[PDB]
Amino acid sequence: MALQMVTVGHNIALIQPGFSLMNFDGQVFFFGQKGWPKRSCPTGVFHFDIKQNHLKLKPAIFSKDSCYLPPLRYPATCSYKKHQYIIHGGKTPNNELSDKIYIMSVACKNNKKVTFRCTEKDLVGDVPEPRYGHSIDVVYSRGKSMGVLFGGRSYMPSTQRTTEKWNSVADCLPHVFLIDFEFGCATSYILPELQDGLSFHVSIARNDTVYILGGHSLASNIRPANLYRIRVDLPLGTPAVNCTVLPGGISVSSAILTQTNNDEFVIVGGYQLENQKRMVCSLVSLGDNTIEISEMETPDWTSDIKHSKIWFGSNMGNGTIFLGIPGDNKQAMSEAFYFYTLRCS
């Protein structure tokens, strides 16, 4: 609702569609920089610091025990209880997909400068695929946690991939992989209500159910206004999963989620369809096992945004959404992206 044009002097060219913000210690951190990690930030992770509507991508050190992960575009970023983000999939700057999970915790913090521990979890079992545009989001069933991974784009299987369509993406078979990072044992779940591969679908995990809103199904090339609630059971034994396509779903893709308040998220629009982007936010109130997709007072969108063709961004983390739109003055050196921040009360 509260829009303000953020300025990015240096390292703005690193912010690329597909970047992921991660809220550690309340300090917000950028990841998924353009190109590969430059020695100004060999890690690719940056202190995201907006001060007086000016953003400063302050390089962020990693740990000794850390796995220096690549800049992943459109990966699956979720969070935890010290507070460790989970980054699955994503397009490496080499436009090859990651199958690794990157558990980016914080190893320590001093003078506001953080050293992360971006360890690498490899997934035994039904490791989903190298994919992107998907949603990883964690559930807490019986206190035990589990990362629900719902599909996003991938590159065709090697047997089927061809260089004339090398970058052709297929929405992964819509499954639900249960990543138990205690063992990294992914567990696929073929849900019959999930029969249309999805991607760029905002997934809101509340306690034990993840609400898949929006998404783009290139299989149908349409953005289904679907509200798949994937409820998860992790009792003593049988890890079970049941999805239910609730009503009230919204047609969005690449939308940006933020937990403005407790169980009160805000999906500031992504795209209603390719050249019709959702210039209307969508409040999402989550009862313990109910969810209503309201429609906020659409912010005073700047013409630069309304008249844009694309827009990207991610959850600063508290109630704010960092947005970017192609500036296209000359998109050569100066400012290839006009960036904004969108607070929510």
């Binding site: 190109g35 850390s66 459109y74 090697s158 260089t163 369509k165 970058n167 690449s254």
Partner: protein, 548 residues
């Protein structure tokens, strides 16, 4: 009727005639002589099909990994199914490529006559369907200042990336003998840098660049693992392929081989050495870096299995932070070697005119005064004007004892004259080695002496020019001095393996995009690639060399 369509096409492309200007010439000759001497545009277009990829049948004994077997694909989209959805990563790109399979078979069937003539010339046969170990010099090159066009299309950069390949050397097996069937006499000729992908992107855009090129890289990797049964002269001849990625500027090499930028303290794309460890040793550097080694080092960086800090880790991988995308061969861009070494000698002249060997601390504006003085004197003496972006022609009219003689007219100190003249003498006894397409023949004296000439150049850089090359040696001085001999032993040449052919093909890219292409973002790349394939067609070049 005396002119076959292929010959009119050769005339159209090698004379850079646009289809419109060729049509003017054709209708005029036909209205004047009455005879339809020139075959009409449609006939030339039907002839192109024979020369463009996607015409000649072929098959790879091991069918290629993730490459369509279709021998009927030509100017496909370089996007390669890259989803331009707003959800995905934008595509500020107009990319059009040949499928490296089809491109290579078109190059071969275009050199069909050349290959057969060369195997005849080598005591060999035409009943010899033996494995020709083709050698393909890959040359990717960002152009820049590519005036984008109005009209419907993605907001591309005013840049380009011309991936191309020069079939440098086709050698066949003859018992135990490896016979050089055909060897590109003009390696860096723009007539032989077969364009393979023209993408209106920016090599700095690793995401876009890689999206466009990784199909080519996959085709290349699969060809490295297979054998091409192509029907030449009516005989199914097998072609093994060896791709040497060498026509990459060091900036692009480092982009695509996972290496830090040129300013890195890790100074070479060939050795793991350091900008400092190379300002001291300067000659003795085994070529260590290799795309395989660089992938190993990238996954070592990523994983950090030894749980090292960023500095210790970086020195363990030696700058391989990014993932090597292209299997670049650890070689030198003789063109950009000349440009960088000559910009370095240019700075050297600026500094000797500044006597910074005595006055290290000098005013920025005084260094500007020195640049200006040298500019004026070179325009006067060497006749070569002050250029902002150093080029190779400058680097050849400047890397000349004539030029240092002219400079010495600007330095009072005669010992500096001796130093500069000896430096240039060594650089000019070295250059022929990494410019000659085969120094073993063109300058074997300079080659067998290259180790000593390089030791001397280095010791004179350390002694007389310590004001600039103590702890900080340029990357191309360290390539010229330390790696050239090993590359000659390995490659047999360097200039043969430069981006000079691709870069000169940038000239044709512009000439076509301006004159021999539909001026529309939908087709500029398609047409330029078509016509720059044709221009590079040894078939048409032969037809244009019939007078000889």
């Amino acid at each position: 009727s005396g002119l076959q369509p292929a010959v009119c096409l050769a005339i159209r492309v090698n004379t850079f005639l646009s289809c419109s200007q060729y049509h003017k010439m054709y209708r005029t000759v036909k209205a004047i002589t009455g005879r339809q001497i020139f075959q009409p545009l449609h006939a030339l277009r039907n002839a192109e099909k024979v020369l463009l990829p996607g015409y000649h049948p072929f098959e790879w004994q091991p069918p290629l990994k993730n490459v369509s077997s279709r021998t009927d694909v030509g100017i496909i989209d370089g996007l390669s199914g890259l989803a331009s959805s707003v959800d995905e990563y934008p595509v500020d790109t107009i990319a059009k490529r040949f499928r490296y399979d089809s491109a290579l078979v078109s190059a071969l069937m275009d050199m069909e006559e050349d290959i057969l003539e060369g195997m005849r010339s080598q005591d060999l046969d035409d009943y010899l369907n033996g494995p020709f170990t083709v050698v393909v010099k890959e040359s990717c090159d960002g152009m820049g200042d590519v005036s984008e066009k109005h009209g419907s299309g993605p907001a591309v950069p005013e840049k380009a990336v011309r991936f191309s390949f020069t079939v440098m050397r086709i050698t066949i097996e003859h018992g135990s003998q490896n016979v050089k069937v055909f060897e590109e006499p003009k390696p860096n000729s723009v007539l032989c840098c077969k364009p393979l992908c023209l993408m209106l992107a920016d090599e700095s855009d690793h995401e876009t660049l890689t999206a466009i090129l990784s199909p080519l890289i996959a085709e290349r990797e699969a060809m490295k693992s297979s054998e091409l049964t192509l029907e030449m002269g009516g005989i199914p001849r097998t072609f093994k392929f060896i791709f040497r990625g060498t026509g990459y500027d060091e900036k692009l090499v480092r982009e695509v081989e996972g290496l830090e930028a040129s300013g890195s303290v890790y100074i070479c794309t060939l050795c793991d050495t350091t900008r400092l460890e190379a300002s001291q040793n300067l000659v003795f550097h085994s070529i260590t870096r290799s795309h395989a080694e660089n992938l190993q080092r990238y996954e070592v960086w990523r994983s950090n299995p030894y749980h090292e800090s960023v500095e210790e880790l970086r020195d363990r991988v030696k700058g391989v932070s990014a993932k090597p995308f292209i299997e670049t061969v650890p070689s030198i861009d003789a063109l950009h070697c000349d440009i960088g070494n000559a910009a370095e000698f240019y700075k050297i002249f600026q500094l000797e005119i500044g006597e910074v060997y005595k006055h290290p601390n000098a005013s920025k504006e005084e260094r500007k005064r020195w640049q200006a003085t040298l500019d004026k004197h070179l325009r006067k003496r060497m006749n070569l004007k002050p250029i902002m972006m150093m080029n190779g022609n400058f680097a050849r009219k400047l890397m000349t004892q004539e030029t240092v003689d002219a400079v010495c007219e600007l330095i009072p100190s005669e010992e500096r004259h001796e130093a500069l003249r000896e430096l240039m003498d060594l650089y000019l006894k070295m250059k022929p080695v990494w410019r000659s397409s085969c120094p073993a023949k063109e300058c074997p004296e300079s080659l067998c002496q290259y180790s000593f000439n390089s030791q001397r150049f280095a010791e004179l850089l350390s002694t007389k020019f310590k004001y600039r090359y103590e702890g900080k040696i340029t990357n191309y001085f360290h390539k010229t001095l330390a790696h050239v001999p090993e590359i000659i032993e390995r490659d047999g040449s360097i200039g043969a393996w430069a981006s000079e052919g691709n870069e000169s093909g940038n000239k044709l890219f512009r000439r076509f995009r301006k004159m021999n292409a539909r001026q529309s973002k939908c087709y500029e790349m398609e047409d330029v690639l078509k016509h720059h394939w044709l221009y590079t067609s040894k078939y048409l070049q032969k037809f244009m060399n019939a007078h000889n």
